Amino acid sequence: DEKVILSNVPFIQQLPELDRGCEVTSLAMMLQYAGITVDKMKLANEIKKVDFMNDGVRGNPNEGFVGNIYTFSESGYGVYHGPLFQLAKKYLPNKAVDLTGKSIEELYKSVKAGQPVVIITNATFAPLDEDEFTTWETNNGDVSITYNEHCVVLIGYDQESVYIRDPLKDSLDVKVPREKFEQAWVQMGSQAISYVKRSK
């Protein structure tokens, strides 16, 4: 059975500099492999941001990174696919693609075609019980959040596993049970960013 892995996708850790840098750090690995000179600190400054709480309203991770990307000592959450995609486009205006809502199989096609995929999921890589989520009210409707939110680069798959770069795990070798992985991914909104080989 077909085992695919993009084992030369660069490896970066969010810590120590970015307590909440999993999205920008995964994005950095993706951009580097695509040929862009960039580091996680530049991306951390460039990502669109929204206040954690303002005028009694919580920030929407669909609008920007919510709160403090740098330090756990201040409130913060993360950022979802929209703003994260806009940042990718700054660097790949003609190749960056938002695969959010497509099927897992599309993502595997991307990887097999040689393009790794940044994905939003949760830190356990398995579906979470409903009571693990909160609903925040924002200026743009309700959003489901979990403080388990995490972001990694999909770099490979086999029949039983997927293979990732996890900006919080100090290792080139991270595989997790495929099925649970996919269900966790779908549960967080099927959010995914990649790019294509040639300009569009």
DSSP single-letter state for residue 76: B
Cα–Cα dist 131/64, whole Å: 25
Cα–Cα dist 75/67, whole Å: 6
Show the CA angle centred on residue 176, arms to residues 193 and 194, nearest 5°: 10
Cα–Cα dist 141/136, whole Å: 8
- What the block records as the tokens of 187 is 């549960």
- What technique determined this structure? X-ray
Give the three-class secondary structure for 163: strand
Contacts of 153 (CB under 8 A, 6+ apart): 9, 26, 29, 30, 116, 117, 118, 119, 164, 165
**Is residue 9 a contact partner of residue 31, using CB atoms and an 8 Å limit?**
no
> Would you call 145 exposed, middle or buried from its count of C-beta atoms within 10 A (0-12, 13-18, 19+)?
buried
DSSP single-letter state for residue 9: S
44: left (phi over 0), alpha (psi -120 to 50) or beta: alpha
All domains of the chain in start order, with CATH: 1-200 (3.90.70.10)
First to last CA, the chain: 32
Resolution in A: 2.1
Cα–Cα dist 186/46, whole Å: 27
| Amino acid (one-letter) located at 195 | Y
Residues in the chain: 200
Distances from the Cα of 149 to the Cαs of 20, 56, 90, 96, 160, in angstroms? 10, 23, 24, 23, 23
